[PDB]
């Protein structure tokens, strides 16, 4: 029952690969839907086209920001930035996929990625999602990252949708 949505990868526009999430939606219902309409773009807007705009290695990759393209902005569903939804759910390691943020209740597009365990984002991030298939995209991904998060190659979200 747990929907499953798909990025595909580009680097400097050149095609890198599928990365594909499991959504929590039995668990995170208004967290895990609201990355999977932004996924298929049925309200008009959501992630086809946006950059990751942050890769720091051994850490994380955040993307989500369609709006301004540089962790200023995006847009949830809803109409305004929702509330953290439960913390069920941790920071457990690689795969993990979760709500970027800047502060208790504040909710956007704005998401990360974990390439490690990050316990001490607990309590401060509603994880709602796990990566299923594609992991080695994402490893490939941060390897243009960089110790303050500027990418090196300009890592786009080329395409994006809802699978099965």
């Not at 049925?42 to 946006?50: D, M, Q, R």
């Not at 690689?94 to 209740?105: D, E, K, R, V």
Request: proline share 4%; hydrophobic share 35%; with cysteine.
């Amino acid at each position: 029952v747990n929907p499953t949505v798909f990025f595909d990868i580009a680097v400097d526009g050149e095609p890198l690969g599928r990365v594909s999430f499991e959504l929590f939606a039995d668990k995170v219902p208004k967290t895990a839907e609201n990355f999977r309409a932004l996924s298929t773009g049925e309200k008009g807007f959501g992630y086809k086209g946006s950059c990751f705009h942050r890769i720091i290695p051994g850490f994380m990759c955040q993307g989500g920001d369609f709006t301004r393209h540089n962790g200023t902005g995006g847009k949830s569903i809803y109409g305004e930035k929702f509330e953290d939804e439960n913390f069920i759910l941790k920071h457990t390691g690689p795969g993990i996929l979760s709500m970027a943020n800047a502060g208790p209740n504040t909710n956007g597009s704005q998401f990360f990625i974990c390439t490690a365990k990050t316990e001490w984002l607990d309590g401060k991030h509603v994880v709602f999602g796990k990566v299923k298939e594609g992991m080695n995209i994402v490893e490939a991904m941060e390897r243009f990252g960089s110790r303050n998060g500027k990418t090196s190659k300009k890592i786009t979200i080329a395409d994006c949708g809802q699978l099965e």
